[PDB]
Amino acid sequence: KNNLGVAVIGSKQYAVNLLWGSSQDTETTNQALNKSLTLMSSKLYSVIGRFQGEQFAVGDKNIGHKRGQVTLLSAIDFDGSSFCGLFPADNELWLVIGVDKDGMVHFDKSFHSKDDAKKFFFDHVAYGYPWDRTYSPSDVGVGESRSISELSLIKGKKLKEK
């Protein structure tokens, strides 16, 4: 077990690197979530609602996820504009996130290595969707250099168990 799934931003701790999904077709959110929990042999989850619909996150206890942790992506406000970014957390962890025009989480990844995070960002995130906004450190030069702490937050949703 490691702690790759827990990021520190200021005085707050957040669950990161969760498996996000939403139902499709005639599948309900509840069915999609339970299918994901079964597939991952996990009991940790969180359902978050957005205007365009709902989605869920499945946690991984092997990387430190535990009931009660607020998921970072649920805490980041969505105002109708999509965004992605490479961000350093306060605890030696790098985060790569991405939310689409409908508020659906496309990316929620954490890395202990900046190089791995940068590589993931460039290979799959930065140019994988028409983001309204893109953030990354100055030495990266993609989009604007902003810290996670500079993003607008709301009360997040905590991981529930079972």
Please compute, for residue 40, the number of CA atoms within 13 A of its CA located in the half-sphere on the CB side.
21
Query: Which residues, 6+ apart, have CB-to-CB distance to 103 below 8 Å?
Result: 50, 51, 52, 78
Tally of helices (H runs) and strands (E runs) in the chain = 3, 11
How many angstroms is the resolution? 1.9
